[PDB]
Design a protein around this ligand. Structure first.
Ligand code: NA
Ligand code: NA
Lengths: 298, 295
């Protein structure tokens, strides 16, 4: 039984030669953790969580440490995780002062009769679960402070993973800092099932990135899976769904897909999207269209 | 075109003879407001909002005043509204101390570059928009206080098709009895709480929120319509899937772009009403439909 892990960063382009290598190493690390969990017989859920925790902790990515700032220069995070076997899910929105929103989303799934907690109640739940509070300042990066000032002045005028485990289970995890200069309490697509991602053993798993409002309006992740159900390949499904978002709501973004049959793809309508996939002892990586590197994974 | 408005309450248990009549009058009033807006040439969005504001203000219904209580005996509300023309939307979650979450969801849609605000940020936005703050107690009913105590010791919506061919949905709720602080249901989530698309139709749902979210109930219903199923087949298939896959019960109302509509549920009951071609349709229990004329 051949397990697969696919990871994505946020559509980033253009980037400096030296930052491109840090992004590359970050993607490799996330996919290595994810694949490593799968190879030891771990679940698709553990794999996607492991991969996303890596990207949250990595300051080079828009999730956890490295999250973009809202209008007040604060880090407000969203995350969701879904299990394709029983459709079990966990999600958090407008979370602050925690290192790993995806672990909190996993906790919502496993420890509550719910699948979505927000802001104050999500903060209270994190405290009750013994999740350590970190200075909100430890999530803020200088690059994100500059981005915010740039955005505010111009106005003068989103990571994830999908997996198929050894037992045939599929899962997705999506985590974000949102959009630069967002309003206080703005909720994106990331914590919303069907938009931020979707996982179903009878179809496959999707994790998305891009303009959250657009992803929400088109239900991007569930839409992708609807084309797969209708007989389209993972590539056709991704193209059709992304294409529809572009034409209908003028939205750009990207997604990663894994079908129940083991087919996978990473596609985007934005400039770039860092991505990596691991399957059959091989690591696939890319950032720009039609520029992919494949290396052997012992 | 012939405009249509469909409204729903929350799935209800066997209720008292006199409570059924207040429920009936509430549903009639919501559909009357909705239909009245449509008949004057108003948009589908204005119609669904008008119908839902009525149900929020009505203490008989689980939205606005009459919202079920959370674990702390407080009212925390969720709402979403969508316009089928451009897929523009507005949603709010864990909102407190405001009379009309649906009006706040409409303001998110019209006055911000976003479509979903939560808790503290939604409250800040409401204040900046001049939305009056009401005491939490004004949203609390005695029936709800009893429900909470009972539970501890062990949801409304509208769809419309306007004269210009636009479709819309509005969904508003108090959530589930004894829910955790900050619990977000299906109601403010596009594709789950509802979905509106001029190229298909509009859906508004009710029931076990977690189940509705997991199956993407409203968008799922519309996928079946896209595949050639009638509004009735689509509703049955989607509700049936929620029941079998995630053990969830609930209900929904649908209006297709062609004018076909239906109200279906897997729960015990679901108060509903529909207005089209000067006629009002109403029911609570399966196959109890009453039809009356309206000039
Ligand atoms: Na990061
Ligand atoms: Na009410």
């Amino acid at each position: 039984g051949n397990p697969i892990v696919v990871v994505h960063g946020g559509g980033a382009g253009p980037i400096s030669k030296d930052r491109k290598e840090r992004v590359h190493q970050g993607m490799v690390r996330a996919a290595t953790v994810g694949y490593g969990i799968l190879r030891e017989g771990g679940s698709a859920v553990d794999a996607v969580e492991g991969a996303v925790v890596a990207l949250e902790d990595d300051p080079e990515f828009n999730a956890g440490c490295g999250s973009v700032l809202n209008t007040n220069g604060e880090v407000e995070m969203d995350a969701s995780i879904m299990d394709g076997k029983d459709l079990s899910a966990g999600a958090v929105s407008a979370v602050q002062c925690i290192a790993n929103p995806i672990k909190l989303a996993r906790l919502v799934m496993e420890k509550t009769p719910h699948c979505f907690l927000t802001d104050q109640g999500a903060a209270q739940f994190a405290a009750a679960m013994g999740v350590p509070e970190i200075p909100g300042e430890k999530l803020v990066t200088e690059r994100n402070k500059k981005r915010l000032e740039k955005e505010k002045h111009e106005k003068g005028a989103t990571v994830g993973a999908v997996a198929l485990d050894c037992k045939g289970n599929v899962a997705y995890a999506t985590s974000t800092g949102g959009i630069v200069n967002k309003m206080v309490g703005r909720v994106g697509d990331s914590p919303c099932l069907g938009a931020g991602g979707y996982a179903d053993n009878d179809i496959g798993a999707v994790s998305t990135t891009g303009h959250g409002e657009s992803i929400l309006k088109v239900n991007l992740a569930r839409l992708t899976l609807f084309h797969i159900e209708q007989g389209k390949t993972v590539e056709e499904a991704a193209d059709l769904s992304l294409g529809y978002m572009k034409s209908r709501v003028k939205g750009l973004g990207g997604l990663i897909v894994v079908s129940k049959t083991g087919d996978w793809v990473a596609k985007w309508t934005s400039t770039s999207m860092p991505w990596a996939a691991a399957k059959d002892g091989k690591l696939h990586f890319g950032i720009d269209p039609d520029d992919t590197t494949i290396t052997d994974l012992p």
